[PDB]
Amino acid sequence: LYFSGCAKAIHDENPSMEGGINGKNLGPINQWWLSGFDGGEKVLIGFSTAFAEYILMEPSKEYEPIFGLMQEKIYISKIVVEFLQNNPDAVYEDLINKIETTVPPSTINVNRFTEDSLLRHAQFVVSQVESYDEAKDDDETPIFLSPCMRALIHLAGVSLGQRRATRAPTKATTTKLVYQIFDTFFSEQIEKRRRCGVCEVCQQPACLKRRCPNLAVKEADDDEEADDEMPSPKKLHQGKKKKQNKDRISWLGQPMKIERTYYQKVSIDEEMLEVGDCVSVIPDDSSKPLYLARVTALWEDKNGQMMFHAHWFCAGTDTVLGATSDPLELFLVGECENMQLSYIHSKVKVIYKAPSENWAMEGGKTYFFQLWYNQEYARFESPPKTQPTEDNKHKFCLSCIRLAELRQKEMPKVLEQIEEVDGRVYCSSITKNGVVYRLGDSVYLPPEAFTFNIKVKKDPVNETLYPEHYRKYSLDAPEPYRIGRIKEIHCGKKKGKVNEADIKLRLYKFYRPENTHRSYNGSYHTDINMLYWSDEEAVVNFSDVQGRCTVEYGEDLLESIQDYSQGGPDRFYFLEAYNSKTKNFEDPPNHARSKLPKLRTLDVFSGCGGLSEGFHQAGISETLWAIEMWDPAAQAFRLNNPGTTVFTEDCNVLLKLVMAGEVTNSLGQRLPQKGDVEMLCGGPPCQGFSGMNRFNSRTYSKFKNSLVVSFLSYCDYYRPRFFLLENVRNFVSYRRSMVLKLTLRCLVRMGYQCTFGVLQAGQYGVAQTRRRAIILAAAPGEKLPLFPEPLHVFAPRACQLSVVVDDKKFVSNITRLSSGPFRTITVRDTMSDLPEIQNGASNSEIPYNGEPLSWFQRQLRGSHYQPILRDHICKDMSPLVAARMRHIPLFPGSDWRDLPNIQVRLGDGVIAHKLQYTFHDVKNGYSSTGALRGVCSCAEGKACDPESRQFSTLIPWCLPHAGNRHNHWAGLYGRLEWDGFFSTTVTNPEPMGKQGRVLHPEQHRVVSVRECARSQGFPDSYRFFGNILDRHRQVGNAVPPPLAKAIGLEIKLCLLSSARESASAAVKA
Amino acid sequence: QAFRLNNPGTTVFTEDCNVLLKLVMAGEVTNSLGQRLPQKGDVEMLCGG
Ligand SMILES: [Zn+2]
Ligand SMILES: [Zn+2]
Ligand SMILES: [Zn+2]
């Protein structure tokens, strides 16, 4: 290619031909380049020739329009680059907004940029962004690898490696203790292929910048995937052991007791050993991991061999903590066993590192132990400190005592008995799992436990019109518990006495509305709480009973049903009796009827205050302090919590300030001090280390001064009674589970009882699939709360709650695996009442125009009247997208693959035309019509021809293009199904985004802010702040209030339980 | 923002001067964003309105 114009003097700013000499057919163009991607808007295009380099100014009249299109491409590319410089870690949806809202100069012939443009210019843009990374050189992550960029590279059929042009770190505010943990770990565990070959990077020979981007992306992508099932982890200390040679072993003193066996307090084994000392045992090599145990007891069996009982300890390395643990720290476990005194090697020193009298105010050699580790649930807890009675002062093993309680709690025992018939022994009450079951109480059971009274082909598609429909093809939630009232408990007999194993129950069946002939229509407006009575009867084993619940007659009530139903858990009600056969509803029979401390709370990374809100609902807290850097969130939080001091400064600074004696910040707000904060919650972001592969120099650096580290410092300084760290599920797998392991380690060094668990929001009454990692911690003194049992039955695929750490399976105390008391909350329940709006709705306050339809709706709107509906506002999508939405059908499951290949007038002059199918798809074949299905030369196996690339099509060119390798982009331009749920927590809904189905089920628009808020379980009264996307962001970052309440109510039990223990010990004092 | 554009060499703190002072009077070498806090001897002339 040759060129011509007026060459000017390098300094000459003038773009007129004035002080210039004219050239023609200027030597073939070697290279062309660019520069200006950093400082100001100095994006200079430059040509390179074997003679010289030229910096282009302005183009000729005739060349203006050709250079015109070149210029747009470039400007967009600048925007993307500068944006990513400032916002790595940005998500697809963030660009699209960045681009869309960037106002281009009049210098550019275009009015504004759209998603369509970006897609049209994807190849150029991406290629440009790749170039910038070679060009300026950091150790920092290449821009082309940010999520937005990988999302684009995948969506747009971008091939990588096409080359071109060129031209103090965060310090976390730690505590002494915390710092050392992450410092020592760096000071310890730290150490140290197959490209694509085909790419233009790979075809180029310490010089090396031959890093394959196709590889680089796979890697980056792979690094965001985890491993979700493996057996329960084998118990420790069941290996062989080595026995030492007998010289002089003999009792010392007089027998402590006698039981066929006789116990002593002291033994000689060359030196002395006493009941309560600790010994070490050596196993059959295998690995050489020295075995320590506490000598529980000592005795001589009837056979005259000398025995001791060994309550094993657990090495820190062997707890979840693994490598991170103090090599000298040991943990108590429910592992003990009888041995011959012959197996002991040496007596060992084991010191109990108990907490101080003012452990709370304490923020900033030999074997020791601190906590009782439960292998299976991964709970570190405060040692039982039950004391030895004189009847077992000699035999005293905590492991044996726990296991005992645990065996008799599990045990099905009978409390009161009545008459007997045949071999059946009728009773009035019994127990299981720590629960008492008396006659006339009600009961939960699996769906299989009993039964009710039951009830009793497509035609061809116009493919010229719906060409992509062929792509449409290449388990659901359980039923909640059955509920019955107990009538007879007749048991069985094991000869002399009752058969505790064969306890049986005769029950009156209840129907739920949708067990009725109503079925799916019972379920809509109905209270999820409500049942119907039935004289239908059943018999099932006690074994199958899942729990007790409270079914009560509506009219037999001294309060409002609402009042009753909100009063506590597992409370149901009936008003009418169903009848299987007459299928009518009559009144029921006559035989069917008859303070809490709020913790003072600092919510770090508070957002608009969802987590705080669910904890407010539970009654267990009062958030007096919040820290949120992003003003709009802060603003919103304030609006919802007037009593809270809401700091908007960086938490690192606010901490340094308290650690310096400051009573107040700049604005003169009240800084919290030691003792103020009873509970500390928060969701620290995991910015530059949230990936699964091993730690690096790079990755650790980030995490070491992360907000996780800062948050843990808050916990160390303030030493709260309780603690909670919320985060995305995959928190527990980041960096080969080290982020979790170090977090736990740091909590243990501090001396906290702590644990972790994964929780599916949808299981607590929200129409959404979203799992969160939850890290609980409770101070010594309090009790470590449990994770809450699912209240809602939910799709098992969603509920993968387990967590593998160092190929060992760690599960939470949650027992409801699958079923639960209440039905699933649907998108319908979530938003079916809200008045119709249209694309681009902006009126914030509007009348409801109608009553609440679903239970759920009734609950988020309040048991009263409220006129205004706030934030039912949705994004003003481009006329193109708006058209697409309009053309997405309403049948459940419809998405872009249902679009018609049609011309459409796009409001204004613009006309979205048909997709041209000009290539063979060799994998996908022809249409029913014999038509081609390929959109790009890559469908044929060739490299992509560009300009074979279409834009502003109603069926987006780029979806067929990359379809086969991305699963047909199933769910893109997809409508939420009334019966379904939110694919995730939505922060900025984009139809070709990564946040799931976001179209409304019926309306040719995307979901509103309020609709999202409803997906999150926010009261309609709850307020948000700032422009629409700020609000969208707010809702979607939040922890859903119903999840927070659930967890909140588990803390309720620890408090109540821990308050009634100081009161049963104030009497004994 | 504007000042920066005109003086690239300048460290432009946007925090409250009262806080930036308390920070130097406490030994801090840098602020939150990790910018370079000035210490005794750095500053030859001090202007302002
Ligand atoms: Zn390659
Ligand atoms: Zn024992
Ligand atoms: Zn292609």
A41 to chain B, any CB pair closer than 8 A? The answer is no
* Distance from Cα A945 to the centre of ligand 3, integer Å: 7
Q: Quote the tokens at residue A809.
A: 């399976």
Cross-chain residue pair A666–B28, CB shorter than 8 Å? no
Beta bridge partners of B36: B30
Query: d(Cα A918, Cα A904) in Å, to the nearest integer?
Result: 21
Distance from CA of B27 to the nearest CA of A (A): 11
CA distance A896 to A973: 5
Per CB-CB distance under 8 Å, the chain A contacts of B16 are 666
* Structure determination method: X-ray
Chain A contact set for B32 (CB, 8 A):
649-650, 652-653
- Tell the residue number behind the tokens 């790749």, with chain if given: A130
CA A994 to centroid of chain Cα atoms: 16
Specify which residues A443 forms β-bridges with. Answer: A484, A548
Q: How far does residue A249's CA lie from ligand 2's centre (Å)? A: 23
Of B18, B26, B30, the CB nearest to A660: B26
> Residue length, chain B?
49
Q: Using CA coordinates, name the residue in chain A closest to B31.
A: A653
- For the annotated catalytic residues of A, the residue numbers are 686
Rounded to 5°, the CA angle B9-B12-B14 comes to 170
Number of H helices, E strands in chain B: 2, 0
Q: In sequence order, what are the residues at sequence separation of 6 or more whose Cβ sits closer than 8 angstroms to the Cβ of residue B6?
A: none
Q: What is the DSSP string of A247-314?
A: S-EEEESS-S----EEE-SEEEESEEEEBTBEEEEEE-STT---EEEEEEEEEEETT--EEEEEEEEE
DSSP A694: P
Q: How far is CA A791 from CA A771, A820, A856, in A?
A: 15, 6, 14
> To one decimal place, what's the resolution in Å?
3.3
Q: How far is the CA of A210 from the centre of ligand 1 (A)?
A: 8
The nearest CA of chain B is from the CA of A664 a distance in Å of 11
Nearby residues of A9 by Cβ (< 8 Å), 6 or more positions away: A19, A20
Tokens of A390: 């004189």
* H or E element, residue A367: strand A367-374
Handedness of CA A564, A566, A571, A575 (dihedral sign): positive
Q: How far is the CA of A303 from the centre of ligand 3 (A)?
A: 83
Considering every ligand atom, which ligand is closest to the CA of A198? 1
The label of the residue with tokens 């969802």 reads A610
Answer yes or no: are the C-beta atoms of A879 and A910 closer than 8 Å.
Answer: yes
Which tokens in the block code for residue A656? Answer: 């340094």
Q: Are A854 and A829 in contact (CB under 8 A)?
A: yes
Q: Which of B15, B20, B32 to mutate to test the interface with A (most CBs of A within 10 A)?
A: B32
Contact residues, chain B, for A666 at CB < 8 Å: 15-16, 18-19
* A373–chain B nearest CA distance, Å: 39
The SS3 of residue A775 is strand
- CA of A957, nearest ligand number: 3
CA–CA distance, A616 with A623 (Å, rounded to integer): 8
Tell me how far the alpha carbon of residue A355 lies from the centroid of ligand 2, in angstroms.
25
Distance CA A261, CA A306 (A): 10
State how far residue B43 is from chain A, nearest Cα, in angstroms.
20
- What single letter denotes the amino acid at residue A166? T
Provide CB contacts within 8 A for A294, sequence distance 6+.
Answer: A276, A277, A278, A310, A311, A313, A350
Would you state the structure tokens that stand for residue A976, as one six-digit string? 């939420």
The answer to whether the Cβ–Cβ distance between B16 and A660 falls below 8 Å is: no
Contact between A511 and A416 (Cβ < 8 Å)? no
Whole-number CA gyration radius for chain A: 35
Q: Please check whether residue A744 is in contact with residue A754, taking contact to mean a CB–CB distance below 8 angstroms.
A: yes
Q: Name which of A168, A656, A666 is nearest B34 (Cβ-Cβ).
A: A168
Chains A and B: how many Cβ contacts under 8 Å? 22
Q: Pick the residue from chain B with its C-alpha nearest to A665.
A: B19
CB contact under 8 A, A662 and B36: no
Cβ–Cβ < 8 Å for A505, A468: no
Chain A residues with CB-CB distance to B30 below 8 A:
168, 171
Place of tokens 């309550």: A311
DSSP 8-class letter at A329: E
Amino acid at A1019: P
Closest residue of B to A40, CA-based? Answer: B5
Chain centre to alpha carbon of residue A849:
36
* Residues of chain B neighbouring A656 (CB-CB closer than 8 A): 28
φ, ψ at A542 (rounded to 5°): -60, -35
